[PDB]
Amino acid sequence: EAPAAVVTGAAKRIGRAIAVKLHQTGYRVVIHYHNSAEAAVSLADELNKERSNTAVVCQADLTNSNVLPASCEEIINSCFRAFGRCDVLVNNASAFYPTPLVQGKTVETQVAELIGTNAIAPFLLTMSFAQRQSSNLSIVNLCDAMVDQPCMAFSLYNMGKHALVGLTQSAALELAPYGIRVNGVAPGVSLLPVAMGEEEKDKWRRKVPLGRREASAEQIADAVIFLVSGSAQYITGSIIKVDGGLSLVHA
Amino acid sequence: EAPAAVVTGAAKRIGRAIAVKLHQTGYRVVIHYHNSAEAAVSLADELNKERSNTAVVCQADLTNSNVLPASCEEIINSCFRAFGRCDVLVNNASAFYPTPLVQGKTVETQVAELIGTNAIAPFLLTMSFAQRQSNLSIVNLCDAMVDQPCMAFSLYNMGKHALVGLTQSAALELAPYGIRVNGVAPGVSLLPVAMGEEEKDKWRRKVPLGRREASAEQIADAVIFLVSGSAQYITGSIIKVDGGLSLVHA
Amino acid sequence: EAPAAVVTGAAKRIGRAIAVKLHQTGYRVVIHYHNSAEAAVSLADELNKERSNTAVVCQADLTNSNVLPASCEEIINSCFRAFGRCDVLVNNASAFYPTPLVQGKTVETQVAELIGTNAIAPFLLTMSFAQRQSNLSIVNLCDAMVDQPCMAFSLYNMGKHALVGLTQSAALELAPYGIRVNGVAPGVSLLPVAMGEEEKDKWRRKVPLGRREASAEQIADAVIFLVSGSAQYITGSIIKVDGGLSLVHA
Amino acid sequence: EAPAAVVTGAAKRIGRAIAVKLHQTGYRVVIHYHNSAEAAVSLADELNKERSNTAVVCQADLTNSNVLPASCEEIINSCFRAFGRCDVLVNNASAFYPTPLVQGKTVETQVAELIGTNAIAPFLLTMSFAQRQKSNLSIVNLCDAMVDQPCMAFSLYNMGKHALVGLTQSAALELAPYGIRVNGVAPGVSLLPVAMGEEEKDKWRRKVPLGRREASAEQIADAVIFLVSGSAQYITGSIIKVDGGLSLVHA
Ligand SMILES: NC(=O)c1ccc[n+]([C@@H]2O[C@H](COP(=O)([O-])OP(=O)(O)OC[C@H]3O[C@@H](n4cnc5c(N)ncnc54)[C@H](OP(=O)(O)O)[C@@H]3O)[C@@H](O)[C@H]2O)c1
Ligand SMILES: NC(=O)c1ccc[n+]([C@@H]2O[C@H](COP(=O)([O-])OP(=O)(O)OC[C@H]3O[C@@H](n4cnc5c(N)ncnc54)[C@H](OP(=O)(O)O)[C@@H]3O)[C@@H](O)[C@H]2O)c1
Ligand SMILES: NC(=O)c1ccc[n+]([C@@H]2O[C@H](COP(=O)([O-])OP(=O)(O)OC[C@H]3O[C@@H](n4cnc5c(N)ncnc54)[C@H](OP(=O)(O)O)[C@@H]3O)[C@@H](O)[C@H]2O)c1
Ligand SMILES: NC(=O)c1ccc[n+]([C@@H]2O[C@H](COP(=O)([O-])OP(=O)(O)OC[C@H]3O[C@@H](n4cnc5c(N)ncnc54)[C@H](OP(=O)(O)O)[C@@H]3O)[C@@H](O)[C@H]2O)c1
Ligand SMILES: Nc1nc2[nH]c(-c3ccccc3)c(CCc3ccccc3)c2c(=O)[nH]1
Ligand SMILES: Nc1nc2[nH]c(-c3ccccc3)c(CCc3ccccc3)c2c(=O)[nH]1
Ligand SMILES: Nc1nc2[nH]c(-c3ccccc3)c(CCc3ccccc3)c2c(=O)[nH]1
Ligand SMILES: Nc1nc2[nH]c(-c3ccccc3)c(CCc3ccccc3)c2c(=O)[nH]1
């Protein structure tokens, strides 16, 4: 039988490209989404046209709350339900906006979204994934290459990403005896936010030493595919920058 | 007029040592505490016997909740109420216990406490400190072993990682205000009251420099360095006080 | 036409596995070696029996000296002489042995060998490589345990640390020329011939993932990924291949 | 009676400021120097005017060669000849200039100067220091906050400073049983070349979060003083950035 993978925030952009490649590689996928129902479904439609009954969707808010644990257990159950197994978890879903330290959402809501999506939900999905277990089990967390050169006023986001590094390493250590590997892919700039101004996107583009451009989503997905593959079987607790050298560049 | 410091979890152990040392250097101090009220007031008494009207206590749960932001603001407000200023904030309070990934409290509670004390409360207290504004600085009690995590401590460890993020993020954003943010990262220091001597000795034996844990004073010494005029250009630095522990391989 | 790679210290162990895999992937290979002459020609025989005119050997001492820059230029010149091009450089050769800080090679020789092989030759090889210039990249064999040094291996460790800086500096400088520079950082892979069986086991039992060292093939897999088209945006990255070993506190 | 320190490259700029403050703290000093005899001597004169017979000067090229280990043994020995003891070693001397990868010093000379001064001499000085011990003994190495965001075309310099981090950690571990601590100070930008145009100096100053300026040599010296003091007695293997947050600033 073919392995199955969960990819969070998989309706669009990097998470979409990750789902697609895992699928092209032979996985069945659970495409998780929060708000993008329509996009999640048309992706599943497209993958199930290629290969019948190989893609399902799964809706969940990953904001931290009293139900998040249940929600995350249900994401992992959906995969077990659809496909009878869960081999791979990609923690890609992420909320992202500025939370300036010095003066909309209340601060406690910002904590819940930024820390819940970037770190608490990953921890709870990891728990549920491991609890439910020639197989090749792994987890890939979508990290941040620039996490030690944080953006101005993005302190909660940055806290969540740093937490996610902690989880990556802690979970690699603790789940090694189960044969579950835990790694990370850390983009620098890849697809820039649809919202982001065009001059603002070019500013970032021009700082990238390898080609003065952003990574494609597919280039990010390549690292993921490597990490879940049989050729990464001794690798756990490793976070691979896919940043074109951006992190190396001084102010 | 004397500067003022807030030290969280200051009723005993390392936080008491940081407040004692801050007091000896001439700070007025707020001794924040959660459950250890007797130890808190007993300390504020010793300190006020030494110079009167220079220590107050302040009780607060720093578990994450929707009122944690108010609570952290009230902590900063307590320092201005007592002393008319707030120059230093030391984030020392921390919950710690195992949270195994494969299986007491609910997990929602473990999240709230481990992440809230180690990370969210430090962020809120930082916002509050900065919003209320010399030599202004913040010092976070980090973990020298943060990149070699203890088995089954993932939520604690996530919290100490996030506290690194904050140290770095806040140092960048608060620089324009002349507010420095740095950290102090013990290895093993005072071991927990729960721990038996045999398990303490197991950790002691791992330390290259002397095969013993840091004294609480030794941690406080580095905090005192970082708040001083001698570290005026230092911000975003996290100083290990670990006697070489983090350098030792498995 | 087929791309070509130079692999240093490729006659045995990890470097051999890398040469083999690069060769299986479609590459022509320069097999560099120092002393291991028989195993080197033996490997090119195998390779060339599989695909004629796709491997050549190239002998060089990579100890630091005033002629190293010439020896390194010759290694790259040899790749061009044999194959008309040089797409990939792998810096794998390395000397390793204790150099205690406190009391039959002289210390000037220990410096030249350990820093030579592990750092200066890589630098010189990278200069010569870039000077002669498609998916062009370089891979350095680094050490996952580098921030957790082995006792009395300061010179070796210094070499590996330097190789980190080289990886990163060269990534930065060569990016405009389309040349990527990355690392693979084993923990414990095939353990030395001369290592006792008790001390091998001792390292094996430390590894979380599977309680065993990596196979050379496992290391090579990560090299293969980094030179491949699935890594076209990766530069300046160092990928640990250590089964979690570096995550384990003392 | 009074403890003794060796400071390499102590005739000007940072090393001088370090030697002055150690002296002000009550150390006797060996002022090592390469070409700057006149500043070295003039400092030793200023210092011996404060306290008779508490400063000596000691010339040596710290370029890697066959003689470098003797020279480094000689620098240590001279502190013992002058003061009867050697309590503190500061590795401050450093060559610094571009060594581009692609196109009158030859490259073997560049290697010898940049690697010798920034790494190899520090190592040899450490072993001579330790050999002679076998009281608060420690070693402070002058590192670089920016070592992971290197300046373009300084690979040999950068490689030396990276090697110097490894030595700081390696020596800390190996010499801990002798009660010798080994730590670093890692400036970001400090005293800038007086020759450099102010306009160019300002581009660097403007990047520094804290104060938009470079560190004084005295500010670097303060961290060195902390690290050799009785208030750092459990500290070893640590590298204190003194950088005004410069290393936290993305491109
Ligand atoms: N783009 C980059 O340059 C970049 C750089 C560094 C790191 N990364 C990391 O790489 C990953 C992918 O980046 P990206 O730009 O593709 O992500 P993105 O478009 O910002 O977000 C991806 C998905 O996250 C989901 N999400 C947001 N809040 C959520 C919530 N509360 N609950 C559940 N899902 C939620 C959204 O799903 P719905 O649309 O279904 O609501 C969204 O489509 C992220 O983890 C990001 O931090 C990206
Ligand atoms: N000790 C070590 O070896 C070690 C090692 C690495 C890092 N560190 C760090 O150094 C710092 C000091 O360590 P320590 O051993 O002195 O700490 P500790 O004794 O475990 O805790 C310090 C205080 O934190 C407070 N705290 C706990 N839960 C709280 C909550 N929900 N709300 C508010 N406050 C709460 C407690 O207050 P009450 O007593 O008033 O209830 C406690 O006295 C910590 O941040 C620690 O993580 C210590
Ligand atoms: N094995 C591990 O557990 C491990 C762990 C961490 C990092 N690594 C790194 O992985 C790489 C490969 O490791 P390995 O165990 O396969 O290496 P190894 O067998 O110890 O050394 C590889 C080759 O380097 C060459 N070499 C040694 N001194 C030389 C000199 N002066 N000039 C030129 N070549 C010289 C030798 O060539 P001849 O036989 O031709 O003389 C040797 O065969 C090395 O960079 C190593 O540092 C290995
Ligand atoms: N300045 C900064 O912004 C900065 C930034 C990062 C790190 N650092 C580090 O901080 C330390 C002090 O910096 P600095 O700017 O004060 O250094 P500097 O002025 O560039 O150099 C200090 C001294 O090093 C000595 N030196 C150079 N080559 C030598 C050789 N071959 N043999 C023996 N001695 C030699 C020189 O002695 P003579 O004058 O006697 O010839 C020179 O005065 C250095 O280690 C540096 O890398 C500085
Ligand atoms: N979920 C999510 N996470 C993101 N992280 C980043 C990022 C973070 C730090 C530096 C650069 C890019 C980005 C790219 C956009 C960006 C650009 C500049 C600063 C912060 C973020 C991103 C995103 O679009 N979605
Ligand atoms: N709030 C608080 N935090 C602590 N962190 C540590 C610690 C953590 C990781 C490695 C070494 C010591 C300690 C020392 C005890 C300890 C040891 C191992 C895991 C968790 C805690 C500690 C503590 O007593 N209180
Ligand atoms: N050229 C080369 N480099 C090596 N590095 C290591 C290594 C280094 C640090 C920790 C563990 C293994 C090893 C594994 C054997 C070893 C173990 C401990 C110290 C130095 C070497 C190794 C090797 O066999 N050849
Ligand atoms: N021996 C020695 N080592 C040095 N390292 C640095 C440095 C290196 C990397 C980033 C910033 C400054 C410097 C200062 C280099 C510099 C000079 C002018 C503007 C910005 C940086 C330095 C030096 O002057 N002497």
Side-chain angles (χ1 to χ4, degrees), chain C residues 95-151:
Chain C
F96 82 95
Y97 44 82
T99 59
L101 291 169
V102 194
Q103 181 84 47
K105 301 191 161 156
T106 64
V107 70
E108 32 273 270
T109 298
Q110 299 178 309
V111 164
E113 285 180 357
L114 296 180
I115 306 301
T117 54
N118 286 292
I120 289 144
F123 162 75
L124 286 172
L125 286 165
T126 302
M127 269 191 82
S128 293
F129 179 94
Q131 210 80 234
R132 308 275 325 247
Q133 312 298 336
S134 100
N135 181 16
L136 297 179
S137 93
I138 308 176
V139 179
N140 303 322
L141 269 93
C142 304
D143 169 343
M145 301 306 280
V146 69
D147 292 313
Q148 289 131 302
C150 294
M151 181 77 72

Coordinates of all heavy atoms in Angstrom, one line a residue, chain C residues 95-151:
Chain C
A95 N 42.7 14.9 8.2 CA 43.5 14.2 9.2 C 42.9 14.4 10.5 O 42.3 15.5 10.8 CB 44.9 14.8 9.2
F96 N 43.0 13.4 11.5 CA 42.4 13.6 12.8 C 43.2 12.8 13.8 O 43.5 11.7 13.5 CB 41.0 13.2 12.7 CG 40.8 11.7 12.8 CD1 40.6 11.1 14.1 CD2 41.1 10.9 11.7 CE1 40.5 9.8 14.2 CE2 41.1 9.5 11.9 CZ 40.8 8.9 13.1
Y97 N 43.6 13.4 14.9 CA 44.3 12.7 16.0 C 44.3 13.7 17.2 O 44.1 14.9 16.9 CB 45.7 12.2 15.6 CG 46.5 13.2 14.8 CD1 47.2 14.2 15.5 CD2 46.6 13.1 13.4 CE1 48.0 15.1 14.7 CE2 47.4 14.0 12.7 CZ 48.1 15.0 13.4 OH 48.9 15.9 12.6
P98 N 44.5 13.3 18.4 CA 44.6 14.2 19.5 C 45.8 15.2 19.4 O 46.8 14.8 18.9 CB 44.8 13.3 20.8 CG 44.4 12.0 20.4 CD 44.6 11.9 18.9
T99 N 45.6 16.4 19.9 CA 46.7 17.3 20.1 C 46.5 18.0 21.5 O 46.0 19.1 21.6 CB 46.7 18.4 19.1 OG1 45.5 19.2 19.1 CG2 46.9 17.7 17.7
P100 N 46.8 17.2 22.6 CA 46.6 17.8 23.9 C 47.2 19.1 24.2 O 48.3 19.4 23.7 CB 47.3 16.7 24.9 CG 47.4 15.5 24.0 CD 47.5 15.9 22.6
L101 N 46.6 20.0 25.0 CA 47.1 21.3 25.3 C 48.2 21.1 26.3 O 49.1 22.0 26.4 CB 46.0 22.2 25.8 CG 45.0 22.7 24.7 CD1 43.8 23.3 25.4 CD2 45.5 23.6 23.7
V102 N 48.2 20.1 27.1 CA 49.2 19.8 28.1 C 49.9 18.5 28.0 O 49.2 17.5 27.8 CB 48.6 20.0 29.5 CG1 49.7 20.1 30.6 CG2 47.7 21.2 29.6
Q103 N 51.2 18.5 28.0 CA 52.1 17.3 27.9 C 51.6 16.1 28.8 O 52.0 16.1 30.0 CB 53.6 17.6 28.2 CG 54.6 16.4 28.1 CD 55.1 16.2 26.6 OE1 55.5 17.1 25.9 NE2 55.1 14.9 26.3
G104 N 54.7 11.4 17.8 CA 56.1 11.9 17.8 C 56.2 13.1 16.8 O 57.3 13.6 16.7
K105 N 55.1 13.6 16.3 CA 55.1 14.8 15.4 C 55.3 16.0 16.2 O 54.8 16.2 17.3 CB 53.8 14.9 14.7 CG 53.5 13.7 13.8 CD 52.3 14.0 13.0 CE 52.2 13.1 11.8 NZ 50.8 13.0 11.3
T106 N 56.0 17.0 15.6 CA 56.1 18.3 16.2 C 54.8 19.0 16.1 O 53.9 18.7 15.3 CB 57.1 19.2 15.5 OG1 56.6 19.4 14.2 CG2 58.5 18.5 15.4
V107 N 54.6 20.0 16.9 CA 53.4 20.8 17.0 C 53.2 21.6 15.6 O 52.1 21.8 15.1 CB 53.3 21.6 18.3 CG1 54.3 22.7 18.2 CG2 51.9 22.1 18.5
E108 N 54.3 22.1 15.1 CA 54.2 22.8 13.8 C 53.6 21.8 12.7 O 52.9 22.2 11.9 CB 55.5 23.4 13.2 CG 56.8 22.7 13.6 CD 57.4 23.1 14.9 OE1 58.2 24.1 14.9 OE2 57.0 22.5 16.0
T109 N 54.0 20.5 12.8 CA 53.5 19.5 11.9 C 52.0 19.2 12.1 O 51.3 19.1 11.2 CB 54.3 18.2 11.9 OG1 55.6 18.5 11.5 CG2 53.7 17.3 11.0
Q110 N 51.6 19.0 13.4 CA 50.2 18.8 13.8 C 49.3 20.0 13.2 O 48.2 19.8 12.6 CB 50.1 18.7 15.2 CG 50.9 17.4 15.6 CD 50.9 17.2 17.1 OE1 51.2 18.1 17.9 NE2 50.6 15.9 17.5
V111 N 49.8 21.2 13.4 CA 49.1 22.4 12.9 C 48.9 22.2 11.3 O 47.8 22.2 10.8 CB 49.8 23.7 13.2 CG1 49.3 24.9 12.4 CG2 49.7 23.9 14.7
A112 N 50.0 22.1 10.7 CA 50.0 22.0 9.2 C 49.1 20.8 8.7 O 48.3 21.0 7.7 CB 51.4 21.8 8.6
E113 N 49.1 19.7 9.3 CA 48.3 18.6 8.9 C 46.8 18.8 9.2 O 45.9 18.7 8.3 CB 48.7 17.3 9.5 CG 50.0 16.7 8.9 CD 50.5 15.5 9.6 OE1 49.8 15.0 10.5 OE2 51.5 15.0 9.1
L114 N 46.5 19.1 10.4 CA 45.1 19.1 10.9 C 44.4 20.4 10.3 O 43.2 20.3 10.0 CB 45.0 19.1 12.4 CG 45.5 17.8 13.0 CD1 45.4 17.9 14.5 CD2 44.7 16.7 12.5
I115 N 45.0 21.5 10.3 CA 44.4 22.7 9.8 C 44.5 22.7 8.3 O 43.6 23.2 7.6 CB 45.0 24.0 10.3 CG1 45.0 24.0 11.9 CG2 44.2 25.2 9.9 CD1 43.7 23.9 12.6
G116 N 45.6 22.2 7.8 CA 45.8 22.0 6.3 C 44.7 21.2 5.7 O 43.9 21.8 4.9
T117 N 44.5 20.0 6.0 CA 43.5 19.1 5.4 C 42.1 19.6 5.7 O 41.2 19.7 4.7 CB 43.6 17.7 6.0 OG1 43.5 17.7 7.4 CG2 44.9 17.1 5.6
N118 N 41.8 20.0 6.9 CA 40.5 20.2 7.3 C 40.0 21.6 7.0 O 38.9 21.8 7.0 CB 40.3 19.9 8.8 CG 40.3 18.5 9.1 OD1 39.3 17.8 8.8 ND2 41.3 18.0 9.9
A119 N 40.9 22.5 6.6 CA 40.5 23.8 6.3 C 41.2 24.5 5.2 O 40.6 25.2 4.4 CB 40.6 24.7 7.6
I120 N 42.5 24.5 5.2 CA 43.3 25.4 4.3 C 43.2 24.8 2.9 O 42.9 25.5 1.9 CB 44.7 25.6 4.8 CG1 44.7 26.5 6.0 CG2 45.6 26.2 3.8 CD1 45.8 26.1 7.0
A121 N 43.3 23.5 2.7 CA 43.2 22.8 1.4 C 41.7 23.1 0.9 O 41.6 23.6 -0.3 CB 43.6 21.4 1.5
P122 N 40.7 22.8 1.7 CA 39.4 23.2 1.2 C 39.3 24.6 0.7 O 38.7 24.8 -0.4 CB 38.5 23.0 2.4 CG 39.2 21.9 3.1 CD 40.7 22.0 2.9
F123 N 40.0 25.5 1.3 CA 39.9 26.9 0.9 C 40.6 27.1 -0.4 O 40.1 27.8 -1.3 CB 40.6 27.8 2.0 CG 41.0 29.2 1.5 CD1 40.0 30.2 1.3 CD2 42.3 29.5 1.1 CE1 40.4 31.4 0.8 CE2 42.7 30.8 0.6 CZ 41.7 31.7 0.5
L124 N 41.7 26.5 -0.6 CA 42.6 26.6 -1.7 C 41.9 25.9 -2.9 O 41.9 26.4 -4.1 CB 44.0 26.1 -1.4 CG 44.8 27.0 -0.5 CD1 46.1 26.3 -0.1 CD2 45.2 28.3 -1.2
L125 N 41.3 24.7 -2.7 CA 40.6 24.0 -3.6 C 39.4 24.8 -4.2 O 39.1 24.9 -5.4 CB 40.1 22.6 -3.0 CG 41.3 21.7 -3.0 CD1 41.0 20.5 -2.1 CD2 41.6 21.2 -4.4
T126 N 38.7 25.4 -3.2 CA 37.5 26.3 -3.6 C 38.1 27.5 -4.4 O 37.4 27.9 -5.3 CB 36.8 26.7 -2.3 OG1 36.3 25.6 -1.6 CG2 35.7 27.7 -2.5
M127 N 39.2 28.1 -4.0 CA 39.7 29.2 -4.9 C 40.0 28.7 -6.3 O 39.6 29.4 -7.2 CB 41.1 29.7 -4.4 CG 41.1 30.9 -3.5 SD 42.8 31.5 -3.3 CE 42.9 32.6 -4.8
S128 N 40.7 27.6 -6.4 CA 41.1 27.1 -7.7 C 39.9 26.7 -8.5 O 39.8 26.9 -9.7 CB 42.1 25.9 -7.6 OG 43.4 26.4 -7.1
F129 N 38.9 26.0 -7.8 CA 37.7 25.7 -8.5 C 37.0 26.9 -9.1 O 36.6 26.9 -10.3 CB 36.8 25.0 -7.5 CG 35.5 24.6 -8.0 CD1 35.3 23.3 -8.5 CD2 34.4 25.5 -8.0 CE1 34.0 22.9 -9.0 CE2 33.2 25.1 -8.5 CZ 33.0 23.8 -8.9
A130 N 36.8 27.9 -8.3 CA 36.0 29.1 -8.8 C 36.8 29.8 -9.8 O 36.2 30.3 -10.8 CB 35.7 30.0 -7.6
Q131 N 38.1 29.9 -9.6 CA 38.9 30.6 -10.6 C 38.8 30.0 -12.0 O 38.8 30.7 -12.9 CB 40.4 30.6 -10.2 CG 41.2 31.8 -10.7 CD 41.0 33.0 -9.8 OE1 40.7 34.1 -10.4 NE2 41.2 32.9 -8.5
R132 N 38.6 28.7 -12.2 CA 38.4 28.1 -13.5 C 37.0 28.2 -14.1 O 36.8 27.8 -15.3 CB 38.9 26.6 -13.5 CG 40.3 26.3 -13.0 CD 41.4 26.5 -14.0 NE 41.1 26.1 -15.4 CZ 41.6 25.0 -16.0 NH1 42.5 24.2 -15.5 NH2 41.1 24.8 -17.3
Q133 N 36.0 28.7 -13.4 CA 34.7 28.8 -14.0 C 34.6 30.2 -14.7 O 35.5 30.6 -15.4 CB 33.6 28.6 -13.0 CG 33.7 27.4 -12.0 CD 33.7 26.1 -12.7 OE1 33.2 26.0 -13.8 NE2 34.3 25.1 -12.1
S134 N 23.8 24.5 -16.2 CA 25.0 24.2 -15.3 C 24.6 24.3 -13.9 O 23.8 25.2 -13.5 CB 26.1 25.2 -15.6 OG 26.2 26.2 -14.7
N135 N 25.0 23.3 -13.1 CA 24.7 23.3 -11.6 C 26.0 23.1 -10.8 O 26.4 21.9 -10.5 CB 23.7 22.2 -11.3 CG 23.3 22.1 -9.8 OD1 23.6 23.1 -9.1 ND2 22.7 21.0 -9.4
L136 N 26.7 24.2 -10.6 CA 28.0 24.2 -10.0 C 27.9 24.2 -8.5 O 27.2 25.1 -8.0 CB 28.8 25.4 -10.5 CG 29.1 25.5 -12.0 CD1 29.8 26.9 -12.1 CD2 29.9 24.3 -12.4
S137 N 28.4 23.3 -7.7 CA 28.4 23.4 -6.3 C 29.6 22.8 -5.6 O 30.3 22.0 -6.2 CB 27.1 22.8 -5.8 OG 27.3 21.5 -5.4
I138 N 29.8 23.1 -4.3 CA 30.8 22.6 -3.5 C 30.2 22.0 -2.2 O 29.3 22.6 -1.6 CB 31.8 23.6 -3.1 CG1 32.4 24.3 -4.4 CG2 33.0 23.1 -2.3 CD1 33.3 25.4 -4.2
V139 N 30.7 20.8 -1.7 CA 30.2 20.3 -0.5 C 31.4 20.0 0.4 O 32.3 19.3 0.1 CB 29.5 18.9 -0.7 CG1 29.0 18.4 0.7 CG2 28.4 19.0 -1.7
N140 N 31.4 20.6 1.6 CA 32.4 20.3 2.6 C 31.9 19.3 3.7 O 30.8 19.4 4.2 CB 32.8 21.6 3.3 CG 33.3 22.6 2.2 OD1 34.0 22.2 1.3 ND2 33.0 23.9 2.4
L141 N 32.8 18.4 4.0 CA 32.4 17.4 5.1 C 32.8 18.0 6.4 O 34.0 18.1 6.7 CB 33.0 16.0 4.8 CG 31.9 15.4 4.1 CD1 32.1 15.6 2.6 CD2 31.5 14.0 4.5
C142 N 31.8 18.4 7.1 CA 31.9 19.1 8.4 C 31.7 18.1 9.5 O 31.7 17.0 9.2 CB 30.9 20.3 8.5 SG 31.1 21.4 7.1
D143 N 31.3 18.6 10.7 CA 31.3 17.7 11.8 C 30.1 18.2 12.7 O 30.0 19.3 13.1 CB 32.7 17.9 12.5 CG 32.9 17.3 13.8 OD1 31.9 17.0 14.5 OD2 34.0 17.2 14.2
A144 N 29.1 17.3 12.9 CA 27.9 17.7 13.6 C 28.2 18.0 15.1 O 27.5 18.9 15.6 CB 26.9 16.6 13.6
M145 N 29.2 17.4 15.6 CA 29.6 17.6 17.0 C 30.6 18.7 17.2 O 31.3 18.8 18.2 CB 30.3 16.3 17.5 CG 29.4 15.0 17.4 SD 27.9 15.3 18.2 CE 28.4 15.0 19.9
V146 N 30.6 19.7 16.3 CA 31.7 20.7 16.4 C 31.6 21.6 17.5 O 32.6 22.2 18.0 CB 31.8 21.4 15.0 CG1 30.7 22.3 14.8 CG2 33.2 22.0 14.9
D147 N 30.4 21.9 18.0 CA 30.2 22.8 19.1 C 30.2 22.0 20.4 O 30.1 22.6 21.5 CB 29.0 23.6 19.0 CG 29.2 24.6 18.0 OD1 30.3 25.2 18.0 OD2 28.4 24.8 17.1
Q148 N 30.5 20.7 20.3 CA 30.6 19.8 21.5 C 31.9 19.0 21.3 O 31.9 17.8 21.1 CB 29.4 18.9 21.6 CG 28.1 19.6 22.0 CD 26.9 19.2 21.1 OE1 27.0 19.4 19.9 NE2 25.9 18.7 21.7
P149 N 33.0 19.7 21.5 CA 34.3 19.1 21.0 C 34.8 17.8 21.8 O 34.6 17.7 23.0 CB 35.3 20.2 21.4 CG 34.6 21.2 22.2 CD 33.2 21.1 21.8
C150 N 35.4 16.9 21.0 CA 36.1 15.7 21.7 C 37.3 16.2 22.6 O 38.0 17.1 22.2 CB 36.6 14.7 20.8 SG 35.2 13.9 20.0
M151 N 37.5 15.6 23.7 CA 38.5 16.0 24.6 C 39.9 15.9 24.0 O 40.3 14.9 23.4 CB 38.5 15.3 25.9 CG 39.5 15.7 27.0 SD 39.1 17.2 27.9 CE 37.7 16.7 28.9

